[PDB]
Design a protein around this nucleic acid. Structure first.
Lengths: 135, 341
RNA sequence: GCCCGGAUAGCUCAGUUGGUAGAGCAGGGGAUUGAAAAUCCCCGUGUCCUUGGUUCGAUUCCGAGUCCGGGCACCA
């Protein structure tokens, strides 16, 4: 859980996912990165399962460079409750991910590792991925 | 000559050990002959069950068909012990045959307060999971284990509790590391110490083990002449021993494995371990140290965000041959990157 | 006849397909007494059933007995 420590507001509107990425559009702090190809929400649960499968395959990680962060929260009601009567309590977290956003990086490990490394994390995200080198 | 060579109602020589009554004559032929024997006839006359056979006799048996059975009087009417070990099971397999019942109520008594507290298996097979270590040979023993206590249950009921996950129970053994603080309390009032740090060939001098880093046979160990209160054996290649003002106070001393009896009880060896954090890992690193001749004094361990655990073993080890062998005993799992001290 | 496992402190019981060994109680150690109980604490205190055995240590692995625990056979 990459939890923010103290947030100005407990709850936000859910936003609309149109446009390209503002930044994070090209890998530069590593040499083997992963751009998303679609747009949805990503949780801390979808980073814990992401970050674990990074280092189980590499067995000795240089760095990981997790770019995105779950800034925006989200709420839902307790179950079986009629509509209205207040926005619910905050439940999890959401990293807001535009398409073409560099998600992770790989620092200085070979291609045949990296082609298999980001493979094993792509099946933990709800987004189609592709493999981008440093330019 | 320790055996009787008696005759069957055909006339075949029946080789049995000596001293046999005609009850012992039955079980060489078949066991159910003993189940159905009433009387005996040797050479015209009936013979009593109080008769003991001799070598070269024709023994006829008064046998019921399937009607009659044994008593308690016959249990010492078996002279020959190998036939009596059949008699040790003959009267058993009709009394214990009843006692499968009192077995069955009391075998299934001892389960659910120890095993089916948490398992709750119906139809049960966990009580029949001891069909791999014990010679059951059929289901009679697993149900009548307490009916005679030849199996002596709470051994086999502990085989029911053989499920040893023990993740919190190692934290209970981490609480044993909490409760063992008091092993330094035998280091007031003196400790059984030889001249173990030989001071430059000169013995019987006041030295102490350095708490900056522990003096072990890696790099050589050097005694610093202090202002007083002892002499510290600083274990050269230390940042404290290297930055010394007044280098004359350093003394090249010996670790003294060259004597008659080596130091059997060296201790206070703290070990730095950098391993990758996964599950089922922290107990097994404690488990290879478990059953190894090594006392554990402090378990200081923590893992980072990226799950590479920084753990420490302030443990006891006695020799560099005891150290470096046990140093290559934290590496049974290969998740661990490196080890330091 | 047959095969299949246990042959572990004083006693209970953990070591188990290979790290010589724990734990509990009992018991002992002295403070204090006629000695106890009470109070103060300390301590394991083992032919791992033997015989052998492939050895660069075996309670366990193997055979060989013995022994315990079994269920199948063998009807004169």
């Amino acid at each position: 859980m990459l939890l923010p420590k103290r947030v100005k507001y407990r709850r936000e509107h859910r936003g609309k996912m149109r446009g390209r990425a503002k930044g994070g559009t090209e890998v530069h702090f590593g040499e083997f990165g992963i751009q998303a190809l679609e747009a949805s929400w990503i949780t801390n649960r979808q980073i814990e399962a992401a970050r674990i499968a990074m280092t189980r395959y590499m067995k000795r990680g240089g760095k990981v460079w997790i770019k995105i962060f779950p800034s925006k929260p989200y709420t839902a009601k307790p179950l079986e409750v009629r509509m209205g009567s207040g926005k619910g309590a905050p439940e999890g977290w959401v990293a807001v991910v535009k398409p073409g956003k560099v998600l992770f990086e790989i620092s200085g490990v070979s291609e045949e590792v990296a082609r298999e490394a980001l493979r094993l994390a792509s099946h933990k995200l709800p987004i189609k991925t592709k493999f981008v080198k440093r330019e | 000559s320790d055996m009787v060579y008696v005759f069957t109602p055909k006339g075949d020589v029946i080789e049995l050990p000596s001293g046999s009554v005609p009850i012992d004559f039955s079980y060489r032929i078949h066991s159910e002959i003993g189940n159905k024997t009433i009387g005996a006839k040797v050479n015209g006359k009936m013979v009593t069950l109080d008769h003991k056979l001799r070598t070269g006799d024709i023994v006829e048996i008064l046998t019921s068909k399937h009607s009659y059975g044994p008593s308690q009087d016959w249990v010492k009417l078996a002279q020959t012990s190998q036939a009596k070990h059949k008699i040790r099971q003959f009267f058993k397999k009709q009394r214990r045959e009843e006692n499968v019942e009192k077995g069955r109520e009391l075998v299934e008594k001892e389960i659910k307060n120890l095993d089916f507290e948490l398992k709750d298996v119906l139809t049960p097979e966990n009580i029949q999971k001891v069909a791999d270590k014990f010679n059951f040979s059929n289901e009679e023993d697993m149900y009548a284990a307490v009916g005679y206590n030849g199996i002596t249950a709470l051994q086999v009921a502990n085989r029911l509790t053989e499920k040893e996950r023990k993740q919190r129970d190692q934290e209970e053994q981490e609480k044993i590391v909490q409760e063992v603080t008091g092993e330094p309390k035998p280091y007031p009032q003196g400790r059984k110490r030889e001249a173990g740090v030989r001071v430059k060939g000169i013995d019987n001098l006041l030295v102490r083990l350095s708490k900056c880093c522990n003096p072990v046979p890696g790099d050589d160990i050097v005694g610093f002449i202090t202002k007083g209160r002892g002499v510290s054996v600083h274990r050269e290649d230390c940042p404290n021993v290297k930055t010394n003002e007044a280098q004359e106070r350093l003394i090249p001393v010996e670790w003294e494995h060259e004597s008659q009896v080596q130091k059997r009880k060296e201790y206070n060896v703290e070990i730095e371990i950098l391993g990758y954090d996964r599950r089922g890992l922290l107990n097994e690193v404690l488990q290879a140290v478990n059953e190894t001749k090594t006392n554990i004094s402090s378990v200081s361990g923590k893992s980072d965000r990226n799950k590479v655990a920084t753990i420490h073993m302030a443990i006891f080890i006695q020799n560099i041959n005891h150290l470096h062998k046990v140093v290559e005993r934290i590496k049974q799992i290969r998740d661990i990157y490196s080890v330091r001290r």
